[PDB]
């Protein structure tokens with residue numbers, strides 16, 4: 407008898423979105439153990455390996471243990487999804503902790519990189535490669551100041567094909583090793599990516615940058631970088647020597663993770679116990695992160711509007727089919743089956759796969775619109791409220807990211823800032839400039855939140 411994910415775990419809430427799918431906070435129905443479950447949709451994510459080799463990898467991943475690697479507990483598969491059940495970490499993404507700090511030094515950078523290299527070293531010893539190591543794969547175990555870094559997604563890229571969509575690709579290009587682009591790669595690609603992260607920790611700027619994804623990739627492929635920014639004079643020679651060794655082009659000549667742990671810089675800056683703060687780096691990192699998160703948020707918002715266009719008409723068609731008399735009236739149980747159908751096929755809400763969760767969601771919608779749950783209900787009104795709820799939630803989510811980005815509380819994003827944001831979002835320059843011209847009818851060279859939102863709607867066919 408095949409084990410079923412929903413027989414064991416109940417979803418608590420959505421934690422967020424990472425490579426290959428959504429991540430839900432779930433709870434064991436017997437033991438109360440909380441876990442983070444990555445839900446991978448088989449429709450949206452292609453497997454690179456056969457069923458056999460995935461199961462073997464899962465079996466190995468479950469037996470591995472290292473304080474800087476996410477612990478994997480369980481693996482399930484049904485007709486539409488894979489469910490990877492791992493340990494929940496509450497400290498958030500590393501870069502989001504770093505920007506909140508008042509000070510940041512080479513000591514703090516070295517302690518971070520030692521952890522990352524320690525985890526990588528351990529995984530490489532077990533023949534597992536990450537390939538997609540980047541700052542958002544570095545979580546802090548908890549919100550404690552001394553919290554360990556946990557690397558997420560080790561081994562997934564070997565089995566699952568990366569998305570080609572920009573909403574899924576934000577940030578990837580800065581960190582990818584050149585050899586990954588060309589097709590022949592091995593565990594050394596993780597050292598390159600860690601070298602890129604280190605470069606960013608110490609200067610707050612990517613070593614390989616550009617105005618759009620392809621220009622970033624062209625720089626990565628050339629493999630050349632400099633330490634000629636003003637940030638770099640504050641920085642020890644040994645740190646730059648380690649970075650050089652990690653950003654060595656030919657992988658056979660590149661330093662291994664284990665040898666990087668013995669490097670002078672790691673040895674000097676992580677030992678027992680006066681190092682100056684890297685203030686310009688923190689400032690740069692603040693700006694870098696803010697830009698990445700707004701571009702991410704903008705893409706997410708556009709995707710949510712498109713998903714709504716899709717799901718709003720489908721849900722209406724599902725209920726119309728169920729409505730035998732054509733009176734427009736369905737009961738709660740029918741609303742639940744109709745909503746269930748919608749969720750199974752679309753797979754845009756991993757939290758709505760369990761039937762109990764859909765029952766709960768319908769009751770939340772019904773409770774919102776003052777409809778009695780025990781009688782017959784006008785479905786067209788339920789559809790409106792259920793979709794309007796989602797639409798409101800999406801807009802609120804974009805706004806929070808707009809406010810986050812607007813660090814001086816100006817209420818505006820300048821035209822220069824839009825260029826950077828849309829460049830990161832890989833929205834064509836002539837296209838957004840054109841949309842900006844339709845919205846900014848007075849050449850102010852800046853947009854407030856509503857205007858930014860209007861641009862995004864125009865940039866997804868509205």
Ligand SMILES: CC(C)(C)n1nc(-c2ccc3ccccc3c2)c2c(N)ncnc21
Nearest residue numbers: 421422424429442444490492493494495558
């Ligand atoms: C940041 C956020 C919401 C995207 N996230 N993501 C995870 C996470 C990442 C990769 C996984 C791979 C296999 C199984 C579970 C996984 C969970 C994760 C986590 N464990 N704990 C906290 N947040 C997490």
